[PDB]
Amino acid sequence: SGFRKMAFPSGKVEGCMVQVTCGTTTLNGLWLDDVVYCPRHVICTMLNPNYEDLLIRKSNHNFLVQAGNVQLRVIGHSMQNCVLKLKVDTANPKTPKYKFVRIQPGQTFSVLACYNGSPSGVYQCAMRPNFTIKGSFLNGSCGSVGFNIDDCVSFCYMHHMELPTGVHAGTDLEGNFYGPFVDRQTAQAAGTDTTITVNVLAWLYAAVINGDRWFLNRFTTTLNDFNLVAMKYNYEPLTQDHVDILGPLSAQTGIAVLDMCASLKELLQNGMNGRTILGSALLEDEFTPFDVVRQCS
Amino acid sequence: SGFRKMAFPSGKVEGCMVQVTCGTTTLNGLWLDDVVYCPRHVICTMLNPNYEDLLIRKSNHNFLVQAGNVQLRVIGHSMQNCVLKLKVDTANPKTPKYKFVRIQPGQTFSVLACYNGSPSGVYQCAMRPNFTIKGSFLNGSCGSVGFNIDDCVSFCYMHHMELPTGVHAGTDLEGNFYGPFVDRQTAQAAGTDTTITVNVLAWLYAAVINGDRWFLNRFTTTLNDFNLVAMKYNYEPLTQDHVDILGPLSAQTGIAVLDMCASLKELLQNGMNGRTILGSALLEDEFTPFDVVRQCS
Ligand SMILES: CC(C)(O)CCOc1cc(Cl)cc(-c2cc(-c3c[nH]c(=O)[nH]c3=O)cn(-c3cccnc3)c2=O)c1
Ligand SMILES: CC(C)(O)CCOc1cc(Cl)cc(-c2cc(-c3c[nH]c(=O)[nH]c3=O)cn(-c3cccnc3)c2=O)c1
């Protein structure tokens, strides 16, 4: 019993974190086999930088990579989109089985926050519909990575910058930003966000699995009638694919997806009336259906 | 910016988790140097067991310890309070610098949930005033450990059982239960719980550090007048030691502890009136002052 915002065990990623210094700028890098990945803005000093120019002016010896108390030698350097790739002379002996994946909004992942190549903590978050994440990051955290584990680590996020609202923007491990953001200091704000409906429904199923039933009712709704209410409350539309994804949870609890939608409609219209669900006073949308099944099963 | 329920990086503990099987019972063990620690109820089959008797009847060969895909040989076995200590023939080469600590209620720690010796996820929780924890644990999780890191891992919790309310009870790593619980199936319920006042105040300071100020006011209260309101709302008394502990956060924000207490009093008396703090609709009490400073600094 119980339901917690649970991260993946971080050991396999801890063994990959390094420090990358370029001049007076230090941030984190990800060391896999004989390559170190880090945000390319480590080469900046930049309202509007030309990274091609900045990199032409660098030599391998301008890059100091530290793995623990050991200096790695840079033997090559290239740029892929917004990531710098530093070839080093020694392969990381702790490289896990891994792949790089670009996630869809609404998907969750674990973040290993690091400073100076040293992991500080681990937490769970979601890619918001507006392609920001609500992380916890201070100066020096750039290059910290987000990931899921399946013995295979799927890296999906590298941290690059904090937006003015205090939310966070970054890239896949090929250097492509999530969202419309660019790695320079200019006026860029997150778009308006929405709530991840399928995740809220997943979390209500988690609550039932854990004995919270007070929000259930005998009514059902049509997908169309539900999505009409969703839009009024700034929730993402629910698709038939979402319904199918919730299938296993609907079967384990015996509550049809469209029956749970009638619960969610009631909750949106009347609030909780002073009650809580899994210890929360608001509707939680950063657990995926997969997250529920993993933790409740 | 941002504030998240953050766990310690789990790698140093992952390397210590093993599987302990005794007959048809399998649970998790903690392998440090040449000893494996696990809950002694692994030797049970038990409304009222006599563990001294059950252990006399065992031999080393009745204990199957598996570290990954390798069998460790048990060469000795003893019982300390409610923990079994299994001496094995090979020292764990991944043993971190570590110590065993018994924490006070209100302190937080990271849990590495494991099944069959294999880590499943990591989350943060607190020792509640009634000496239970609100964890996330399924059958087979017994022997999962709680810990803090300082390069030294301080183990503070080993999981033993789930209570009927869905909360969790266990021991320090010397086998002494937190709280009045015993490791057998009998009628034992958690005592009435209370809210950890100093932690709620810590979390309000975190909110100010992150730009939530709407709950602040110009008033101050006396420690005595505050504790009068605390008791009415089932909050732990605030002591001068708590006030002193909050010193650094009070200094960084320039808000006197007793000024923040007047905020907390208002919040207890009038609620949030539909507003949120650090993304929560209720007052959070599972961050210590130390947790705030670590994450905000
Ligand atoms: C355009 C916009 C988005 O509106 C305003 C911000 O614009 C940028 C653009 C770029 Cl290209 C980098 C950064 C940035 C740089 C650094 C950094 C600089 N120099 C170092 O030695 N080390 C660092 O870690 C840190 N953090 C940051 C701060 C807090 C949380 N997360 C990230 C940053 O956010 C910001
Ligand atoms: C007296 C009281 C507290 O009121 C009722 C419960 O009483 C006990 C007493 C003891 Cl001594 C053990 C357990 C228990 C045993 C096991 C277990 C048994 N056999 C195995 O092969 N493996 C196991 O993992 C598991 N979980 C458990 C379940 C869910 C979450 N956390 C723990 C358990 O809670 C419960």
Convert A13-55 into a string of H (helix), E (strand) and C (coil): HHCCEEEEEECCEEEEEEEECCEEEEEHHHHCCCCCCCHHHHH
**CB–CB contact A166 B1 (8 Å):** yes
Q: How many CB atoms lie within 10 A of CB B197?
A: 23
Burial class (CB in 10 A: 0-12, 13-18, 19+), A223: middle
Sign of the alpha-carbon torsion through B111, A116, A30, A287: positive
Q: How many CB atoms lie within 10 A of CB A66?
A: 16
Sign of the alpha-carbon torsion through A225, A228, A234, A235: positive
Q: Which ligand approaches the C-alpha of residue B113 most closely?
A: 2
Q: How many CB atoms lie within 10 A of CB B117?
A: 20
Q: Phi/psi of residue A209, each to 5°?
A: -55, -30
- Resolution value in angstroms: 1.8
In whole angstroms, what separates CA A36 from the centre of its chain? 21
Enumerate residues 6+ apart whose C-beta is below 8 A from A285: A126, A195, A196, A197, A199, A200, A203
Yes or no: say if B34 and B91 are a contact pair by the CB < 8 Å rule: yes
Enumerate residues 6+ apart whose C-beta is below 8 A from A141: A27, A28, A113, A114, A115, A159
Rounded CA separation B2/B206 (Å): 9
Q: What kind of experiment solved this structure?
A: X-ray
CA distance B52 to chain A (A): 30
Q: How many CB pairs under 8 A join A and B?
A: 119
Residue A146 gets which letter from DSSP? E
Q: How many CB atoms lie within 10 A of CB A163?
A: 15
3-class SS of residue B61: helix
User: Is A136 near chain B, with CB under 8 Å?
Assistant: yes
- In the structure, which protein residues have their CB atom closer than 6 angstroms to any atom of ligand 1? A 25-27, 41, 137-142, 161-164, 183-186, 188
Amino acid at A178: Y
CA-based nearest residue to B67, from B28, B121, B123: B28
Rounded CA separation A254/B55 (Å): 44
CA-based nearest residue to A216, from A253, A244, A187: A253
**CB–CB contact B136 A14 (8 Å):** no
Chain length of chain B? 297
Q: Long-range contacts: A241-245, Cβ < 8 Å, 24+?
A: A242/A197, A242/A198, A242/A201, A245/A198, A245/A289
User: Is B295 near chain A, with CB under 8 Å?
Assistant: yes
Residue of B nearest to A164 (CA): B1
CA of A88 to the centre of ligand 2 (A): 50
Q: How open is the CA angle B97-B102-B105, to the nearest 5 degrees?
A: 130
CA of A159 to the centre of ligand 1 (A): 9
Rounded CA separation A216/A198 (Å): 17
For residue A147, give Cα distances in angstroms to A94, A159, A162, A199. 16, 12, 19, 19
Amino acid at A80: Q
Report whether residue B114 contacts ligand 2, using a CB cutoff of 6 Å.
Answer: no
E strands in chain B? 17-22, 25-32, 35-39, 64-67, 70-72, 74-80, 83-88, 98-100, 108-115, 118-126, 145-149, 153-162, 168-171
A248's tokens: 């296993």
Amino acid at A154: S
**CB–CB contact B9 A11 (8 Å):** yes
Yes or no: say if B110 and B124 are a contact pair by the CB < 8 Å rule: yes
Among residues 76-115 of chain A, which lie with CB inside 8 Å of chain B? Answer: 112-113
CA of A170 to the centre of ligand 2 (A): 43
Rounded CA separation A102/B55 (Å): 53
CA distance A92 to chain B (A): 16
Taking the CA atoms of chain B, what radius of gyration do you get in angstroms? 22
Among residues 22-61 of chain A, which lie with CB inside 8 Å of chain B? Answer: none
Yes or no: say if A251 and A243 are a contact pair by the CB < 8 Å rule: no
**CB–CB contact A135 B4 (8 Å):** yes
Q: Which residues of A are catalytic?
A: 41, 142
| H-helix or E-strand spanning residue A77 | strand A74-80
Q: How many distinct helices (H) and strands (E) make up chain B?
A: 8, 13
Rounded CA separation B94/B187 (Å): 40
Report whether residue B40 contacts ligand 2, using a CB cutoff of 6 Å.
Answer: no
B189's tokens: 């319920």
